[PDB]
Amino acid sequence: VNSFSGYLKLTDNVYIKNADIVEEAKKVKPTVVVNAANVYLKHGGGVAGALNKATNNAMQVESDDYIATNGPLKVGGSCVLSGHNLAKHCLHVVGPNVNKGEDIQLLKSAYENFNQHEVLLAPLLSAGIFGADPIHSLRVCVDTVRTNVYLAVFDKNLYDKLVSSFL
Numbered sequence: 001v002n003s004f005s006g007y008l009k010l011t012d013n014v015y016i017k018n019a020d021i022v023e024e025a026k027k028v029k030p031t032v033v034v035n036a037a038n039v040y041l042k043h044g045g046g047v048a049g050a051l052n053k054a055t056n057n058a059m060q061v062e063s064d065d066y067i068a069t070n071g072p073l074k075v076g077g078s079c080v081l082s083g084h085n086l087a088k089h090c091l092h093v094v095g096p097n098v099n100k101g102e103d104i105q106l107l108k109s110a111y112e113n114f115n116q117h118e119v120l121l122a123p124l125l126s127a128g129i130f131g132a133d134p135i136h137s138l139r140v141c142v143d144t145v146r147t148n149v150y151l152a153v154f155d156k157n158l159y160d161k162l163v164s165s166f167l
């Protein structure tokens with residue numbers, strides 16, 4: 001039993017809710033919140049901009065130190081940093097950005113990072129400003145992630161479409 005409330009169960013291990021991931025994180029304080037990161041951990045907009053704003057820019061300060069030490073992430077890769085006031089940990093995961101021409105096949109590799117964590121609160125990778133089809137992203141999630149994933153979808157119209165078209 002865990003503290004996530006109001007989710008629709010899609011599969012044995014995947015759950016979905018129309019929610020603001022920032023507000024969901026603030027209330028649940030999950031062990032892991034997933035950020036929709038880029039390779040530079042520049043959290044300017046989308047999910048990343050919103051998560052970072054909710055930390056009063058502490059996420060960006062920590063991220064800049066990480067990059068200065070380690071260099072950029074790989075597309076499809078991840079790193080674990082602090083969750084600040086939102087979660088114990090933040091798993092920064094880089095899905096491919098279609099608006100930069102990155103290979104959508106890397107979306108499966110991105111979701112594989114979730115399997116290193118027993119339970120996660122997450123957005124749909126490569127959705128939103130990353131330019132992928134969120135229905136495809138949900139399919140890859142379901143077919144790749146084996147751990148327990150609680151997906152927060154900000155847009156109510158999109159959430160209803162994801163549910164109604166789910167196979």
Ligand SMILES: O=c1[nH]c(=O)c2cc(S(=O)(=O)N3CCCCCC3)cnc2[nH]1
Binds near residue numbers: 020154
């Ligand atoms: O404050 C915020 N809370 C959020 O949950 C959030 C989620 C996303 S999104 O890319 O995952 N997306 C989901 C796909 C398309 C619908 C529109 C949103 C972007 N910005 C956000 N800002």
